[model samples]
Every structure is written in structure tokens, then in C-alpha cells.
Target: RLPKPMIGFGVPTEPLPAMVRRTLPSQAVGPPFFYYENVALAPKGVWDTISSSLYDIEPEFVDSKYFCAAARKRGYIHNLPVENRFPLFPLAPRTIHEALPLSKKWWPSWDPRTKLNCLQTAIGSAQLTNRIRKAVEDFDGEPPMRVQKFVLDQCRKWNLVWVGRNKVAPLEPDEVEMLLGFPKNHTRGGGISRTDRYKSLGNSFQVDTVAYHLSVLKDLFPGGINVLSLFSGIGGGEVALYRLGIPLNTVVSVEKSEVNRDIVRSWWEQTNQRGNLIHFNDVQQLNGDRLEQLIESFGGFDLVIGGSPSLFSSYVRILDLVKSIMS
Candidate 1:
């Protein structure tokens, strides 16, 4: 059986307002260093050299601005390094147990706890004005009325009383896995303790979702493929590929977090998946020049896959700053 959801674990005790004030920088316009301006206006080849030097591999330094612009033009998410994109959530200087007490106090009034505040909901909806119509048009299936009512009841309990223009759709955990492209039952260790399982999920990508996408790609090109996965959280993608019986010659995964990398290495050993699993201690440390040599040593990869934490919404913009500086 699946574990019930619990709230307030590892939540900080510091007042939200104070925490935000302390964590956020006072400067409004840009980061502490006005590095973006320099990168934007930097002469040709400058960024490339810097990127190459930093990555320890020969880099094809295209303009940083151009890279973002080109990604937007192509409608794909910018493939910024994970550390740059998704920073770890900040925590107050306290043990998880210590933080929980504060989180419990604030839990009832937390923004995520609120279901629907009409004024706030309206404003939030307005912010999504551009995507609202298209989002509605894209709703393909009906959801269970009982689930909707349950959600509504939970919202009411939490003082979420406002209804927004946007429609809500909830998925079962299995469905979520499917949407993410992993197969049903692709995830193991689901039978573990709830807290541990939740942590695993939080630290993982939807392997089923990745697998689904790979299925499409595999059908398009019929042959063994070399793959490089960055920010590889516990070898989820590799597991999916193995399950699907895909022929993989090599997989060089880069991850900076020792904890995560250790877990992945353990999984690799346990599964005994046939492939080279080269783990990098740090992506940033693998400068472009070093990366080139490494890639050459392993032969080239045909596909590069991995997830980075989302950057734009997060406060830590150092990854962006680093890329800007190196570029």
C-alpha cells in the first residue's frame, strides 16, 4: 500500500517573511555581480575560452544571449547546467526536527496550504492570462468527481475558498509516472517507509516518463546508442533503458552531489547493468577541455539526457552567473 502524505517535515521554523528578507538580495536589478552585462556584450571567442577553461574541455562557446534566445526560438527549455538551474531549497540553520516545530506553526497559513483565496487566485489566474485559454483547450480527459470533492474539502479545511479561472487536474501516482514516460511499476522501493520513499521521489525523475520519450526516439533510429546523462539522480534513466531492453554501450553520468552519486553507483552495482558508468564528482569541475578529452576517451555519445533544477523561479542564480562568467 502507498503511504499517506504528511506535511511539515524539514520545514524551517524561521518566520517566512524574515527568512525571505534574509535570503533574498537587496539589489533589485541583477545579481551582486553585474556579470550578465559583461557576458551579453563580451567579444566573440571570449565566452568559449572561458567555458572551455572552466569545464576543462574544449567548449563551443556560442553567445550566452544567443544560446538562450535560440533555445526559446526552438521552444525547448534552456539546457543550462543543473546546479545553475535548480538550486537546493534554502533551510534555516536548524536540525530537521528543529525546523519541523516552526513549520508546524506556519503550516496552516502556508501558501501551498491555501487552496483558493479568490483575490490571490484571481491575480494568479491573471498572471497566467497568456496560457489560460490554451491550457483549457488542452484538457483531454475528465477527472473523478470524488477526487475533486476531496480536493475541495481539503482546500476548505485549509481556508482555500476561492475558485480561479484555471481548471485543476490531479493524477494518481501511477499516472504521474506514465505522464513522465516511465512504465507502470517502473519504480522499486515504493514499499519503503513513506518519508524515505518521498525523499527518493523528490530526488528522482519520473523514469517511466523518460522511458516513454526514449521509446519514440528508439523507434525513429534503430541501433545501439551512446548516451551521456547529466545530473543523473540514481540512474533512473539507465534503469528504464535496461528494462526496455535498449542496447547501450556507454553512459557517463555527471552529478555533483555525493549523496545522490553514491546512491546511483550502488544501484549500478546492484543491477549489474552492462555499460560503463563513469561518475563525475562535479559538473563544474569538468571544464570544457577536460570534458572533450573524457568524451574522446570514451568515444562520443549520441544522446545526452538529464535534468537540472529549474533556475528562473529559484533565487540562487549562480549557475547562470557562472555560465555567463565562463562564456
Candidate 2:
């Protein structure tokens, strides 16, 4: 029998010391003080309100160290090492609507609202749907070609231009979601529109592709397996695992991006698959000690898998970071 492929996730950085200490007490003593600003949490959230309120009352509170001291006094850091002290920030909340304004701001050339409407209309129209159906019929087993032609026809109708002449047509966010096989209502959060769905999709790996691959892998290696996904964005691998009907012993997912982590956490909870899923807001803060402790307590992981984001333009910067990490 072939060995099952191990999957691993990767990202730019790790979690903050304070945050890790909060989650994993057993291995929190080794690291000394770390200095960094929080990015995943919004600057204007409930945590910020509390921090600001405390500072206002005292007028001398400068940083997270001040709050850390208070938390220690309250017995949250009783056994954790002082050297492991790091600032904690609230995880950022992302909705599709929240991202729409930002996307519009950054890509000022394209009006987000108008673009979304145009894309949605184009996708929902019977003409485009029929074209997609016909293309699929013509291609028969060739999925890529069908997808390409559907995208091209939609782009033409939207008057959207592509950056490269020889490249496939530039797809709008909604259209891309359709191509990737996500349901239109999959992103709806209650009555509120999640504008961040597009950004999430951009950051996420294609679920359909992953599901297909997992099905193939399971056929090759049918056995008990657990996955430790580093830099896991929204538990994409977990989704694939569930879809394939594979029994996942555990999925220890680490994601440093606060917004993405929040999404993952929410999904994990909503699914009520707590025993099978574990999430961390930071992956860089993860070390051998923590991994060993988790293995000892929960059970050993069968596979380590995840994708790391690319930092270098080519391979140069990536090679350097790898060398630095190893050294």
C-alpha cells in the first residue's frame, strides 16, 4: 500500500507570544519577549475599546506590556514564562461587505458595487448559463476548457479587460466563485452581506480541487490519519477531508492572519466538529515543544500538511527565508 500524502500549510509569520501563551500553556515558557503590532485584529474593536478605556483612565498605559501585567495579576499567566510575553489583540472580523469598501478603495479604477452587480447579473443570466452548459457538453470530460470558455464569454459581456494578451480571461469575484464550484449562498452570513467573501476566496485554496485530490489520495492510502495543517486558511483542507468522507483523527490548523483565523474558528464551531478540529490564530509561535505536548495529550498526528504563502518574487527570497529558518 502506498503511504498517504502528508499535507502542510505555510504562511509569512507565526502567532504573537501573548496569544500562544493563552492557548498553549505547556510550551509557553521558552520564547523571550517579542515585539510586533497586531494586524489580524481591527484597531477599532471591543478589545481596542477596553484597551483605550484603560489607558484613558490611567493616561500612562503605553503598550501591551501594561495589559499583560494586569492579566498576570488576574492569574491567567500563572505558569507561563515571563519571556514568553507578547501582546494580544482581538481577532479581526471580516464580512463580505467590510471588504467591498476596501476593495473599492484600493482598486479605484473599478467600482466595487457596480462591478459586483455586473458580475452577478452576468453570472445569473440564462445566456451565460446556457453558454456554460453548452461548453461543458462540447468538452465532455474536459473541465478546464469548459471553465475557460465560460469565463471568456462572461468577460466579454462585462467589457472586462485582461492584463496579459495570451492569458485566460480576467474573471470577476463572483464569476471566479462560480468557476470554483462554491454555492452562491455559501458566503451569506445571516442577513448581512459578507463583502469579504471575495478576499477570502482570493486567499483560499480551491476546495473542489482539494476535494478531488483527497478522494484520489484516500483511494491509494485507506487508513487512520490525522493532518497538521500549518498556515491553514479557513480550514480548506479540513473541508476537503470532510467532503471525501475520510475519517480525520484530528486537524490541527494554524493560521496567523487574525481575520482568516476568525473565519476558520467560526466554521469549526458551526460545524460542531470540535473533537476533530483544532485551530490556532498563529502558526509561527508553534514550536517542537507545543507539537509534542499536543501529540502526547491528544494522540499522535499521522500527517503534517499545509501550504505556505510565497514571499519571493521568484525563488530567491524563499530560498533565503528557508536558509534563515534552518540556520
Candidate 3:
């Protein structure tokens, strides 16, 4: 059964209790560790289904609210070591003030949100804020309880923050990037649209949360690690590994979105990674022979990451394919 609060086992910030480490079967041991992630709030039995599909390994559910000033409840299924896991240094802002220092001046005592809800794909538009302002100031002075209730409801729905007197605005793209632990302007430039940036970012893995889980890999592979990343939206997994100071010997990334692929490539180049980066626009293109060939070419992948529920079958296919090659 999942924990009451859905914080499975524990998180780096507030660990609940010690968890016993289980030994993987002989075939599941060794390199080419795999990690999968998805929203923890999925329909009932979703996690159970995922667990049965992936070697019956229980998911490690965690909320990114502990890592950042936002709530991102996700469950990670990985074969990586749990012990000795360390968080990213200089821990991210814990509250709204810490995250956005400037907003401190404008925050109202009535609005009591220290951490934001999950950063979603959509946000309140300018017109929506205008409507909110009008609704609150319809009678002047402090809004009546009913008006305040309506306004606060909208603010929570859109994760709006106080910008000025009676003014609440949605978070900027840069703010979303920071909250998700991505470098500033990560999804910016390259002719990307604001809406597209929000969508891409909302679909990303919170880097700090993932990095803490992947931190154990740093000491394991001092030389470098070959990575096979699927559905690699903006290279969130890559960014996590990179931020952990883990070297990338070879990264074969499969992402469908040209814009997302471009973002990953640009970041790879900007970071000056001295490793081979092969891009494939589709996962169907990677067949058994192709997987074998790539595995042989790179010796073998050390890590396989990324999981879009719709494409989880592909993730399993690729994992089994790699397992066959290795075995």
C-alpha cells in the first residue's frame, strides 16, 4: 500500500524512516541501470501496473516540494542504489520569498502560500488577472469574504503570485525554469514560443529531485557513463546527471519534438560535453539490430532513463532489448 502522504520510503529532505534495501536478481544486477518516473496521482492501480511491468520493483514516491518551492509529486522506479544518496548542494529556495526575493514586498498577508502547487502546462492570462482584479475591487477596500474566496481559488488554481497591491500574476518562464532546477532560459530562444516553453517545462523532470536519486551514480562511474534517454524532453535526465558532475561518455537520446531535441542539442553543445550524442526522432526506429549495434558500438549503456506513460511500453522494450544484448 502507498503511504498516506504518498511519500514512499522517504525523500532527501525529510526522510521518514530507514528502508531495507532489496537485492536484485542476478540478471538485474550490474550496469545499464534503468529509471522510470510518472505522476504519482495517476488513477488507482496505475503504480501497481507499472511495478508489475518493471520487475515488480516498488516505486519510490516523492514530492518535489521537499526539494523546491513547488509541489511535484512523482514516483520513480529505478534500479539505482538508494543508500549514500546525496542532495544537490546549496539546496534550492524553500519558500516563496526564498525563490522570488522581489515578491516579498508585494505579498499580501491574506494569501498564505509559501510553496506553489505543481507547475502545470497552462497559466492565467493577462485578461484573467484583469478579471480577478475587478472581482476583488468591485466594492473597494478589502474584498468581501465571498470575493476573497473566489480570487484565492483562482490564484491557487493558476499558482499566481502577488506582484503588487491586489495584483497576482502567473510565474514567468525563467521562474519556472529555476523552480524545475533547469538553467535560466533553458527552454528559451531558438524561435520557441512562450506557450511551447511552458508545455515543455511542465512535462520535465524536476532536476534536483532526480539528481538526488542519481547522485549515487557519481562515485560508481568515475570514468564516465553511457546513457540511453528516451522521450528526452529538454534533456532533464541528462541535466540531472550533468549537474551531478557525472561524465557522459556517450548519450543516445530519442525525442520526437524537434524543438525539444533542439533544446537538448543546444544545451549539450553549450555545456561543451566531449561525448558522442546521437539523436533519433522516434523510438520505433530503434530495432533489435540497431540496439545491438549501438550497444556494441558504445560498449554498453550504463543508464537508461525517461518514462512517458504512453510510451512506457517502448521503455520496457528498449530495456529488455538492452538486457538481451548485455546478457
Task: Rank candidates, TM-score, best first.
Answer: 3, 2, 1
Report the candidate with higher lDDT, 2 versus 3: 3
Candidate 2, residue 78: Cα displacement in angstroms equals 42
Candidate 1: list runs displaced more than 4 Å: 1-197, 219-223, 310-327
TM-score per candidate, chains pooled: 0.39, 0.41, 0.95
Which pairs of residues collide in model 3? none
Q: Rank the candidates by lDDT, best first.
A: 3, 2, 1
User: Which candidate tops lDDT?
Assistant: 3
Better of 1 and 2 by lDDT: 2
lDDT of 1 by residue, 1-327 (tens): 111211001112222222111121222212111111011224447545433322322221111111111000101111211111111122112221131232333232222331111111111223333333343334332324554455445444322222233322222233323323333443444244333333444445434323423443344335655666666665666765665567667777777666556666666667676667788865555555655665567655555554533221121232333233332
Winner of 1 and 2 under TM-score? 2
Estimate the TM-score for candidate 1.
0.39
lDDT of 1 at 243: 53
Which digits, one per residue and each the tens of the lDDT, describe model 3 over residues 1-327?
A: 446665555566775566647667555566679999988878668887888788877788888888999998888888888778888888999798999998889776667789899999998999989988888655645768887888888988999988877678999999999999999988999978999999999899999999988999999899999999999989999999999999999999999999999999999999999998999999988899999999878888889998554478888888889877887
lDDT score, candidate 2, position 7: 14
lDDT scores for all predictions? Answer: 0.37, 0.39, 0.86
Once model 1 is optimally superposed onto the true structure by TM-score, how far is the C-alpha of residue 215 displaced, in angstroms?
A: 1.4
